[PDB]
């Protein structure tokens, strides 16, 4: 389908790290101007 | 920006975008003319 997909593993992160890694990730998504996101997670991680 | 930085493309597109929507002209006219001293008979 000629799709450009940036695949990130959110699976392994320390609970102590928490928000910080997410901040880094979403900022890096903002610099790439990626406005479209697929979560692919269970309800817990989706909520986080 | 430093070579191979992650900010290069974003700042490039940033300058372009800010240029096309006329912000640069606005700031230029803001800090040069509008605040100038010199503006009958």
From Swiss-Prot, chain B:
Where found?
Cell membrane; Postsynaptic cell membrane; Postsynaptic density membrane
Instruction: Provide the coiled-coil residue spans.
Output: none
State the tissue distribution. Detected in forebrain. Detected in dendrites of neuronal cells. Expressed in the pyramidal cell layers of CA1 and CA3 and in the granule cell layer of the dentate gyrus.
Q: Per the entry, what induces it? A: Down-regulated in the pyramidal cell layer of CA1 in the hippocampus by global ischemia.
Q: Where is this site: Interaction with the cone snail toxin Con-ikot-ikot?
A: 17
The post-translation modification note in this UniProt entry reads: Palmitoylated. Depalmitoylated upon L-glutamate stimulation.
- Additional note from the record: The postsynaptic actions of L-glutamate are mediated by a variety of receptors that are named according to their selective agonists. This receptor binds AMPA (quisqualate) > L-glutamate > kainate.
Instruction: Spell out the family assignment given in the record's similarity comment.
Output: Belongs to the glutamate-gated ion channel (TC 1.A.10.1) family. GRIA2 subfamily.
User: What does UniProt say about this protein's domains?
Assistant: The M4 transmembrane segment mediates tetramerization and is required for cell surface expression.
- Oligomeric form and interacting partners: Homotetramer or heterotetramer of pore-forming glutamate receptor subunits. Tetramers may be formed by the dimerization of dimers. May interact with MPP4. Forms a ternary complex with GRIP1 and CSPG4. Interacts with ATAD1 in an ATP-dependent manner. ATAD1-catalyzed ATP hydrolysis disrupts binding to ATAD1 and to GRIP1 and leads to AMPAR complex disassembly. Interacts with GRIP2. Interacts with GRIP1. Interacts with NSF via its C-terminus. Interacts with CACNG2, PICK1 and GRIP2. Interacts with GRIA1 and SYNDIG1. Part of a complex containing GRIA2, NSF and NAPA and/or NAPB.
What function does the entry list? Ionotropic glutamate receptor that functions as a ligand-gated cation channel, gated by L-glutamate and glutamatergic agonists such as alpha-amino-3-hydroxy-5-methyl-4-isoxazolepropionic acid (AMPA), quisqualic acid, and kainic acid. L-glutamate acts as an excitatory neurotransmitter at many synapses in the central nervous system and plays an important role in fast excitatory synaptic transmission.
- Please report the name of this protein according to its UniProt entry: Glutamate receptor 2
Instruction: Tell me which species this is from.
Output: Rattus norvegicus (Rat)
Highest lineage ranks of the organism?
A: Eukaryota, Metazoa, Chordata, Craniata, Vertebrata
Covered range of the whole protein: 757 to 804 of 883
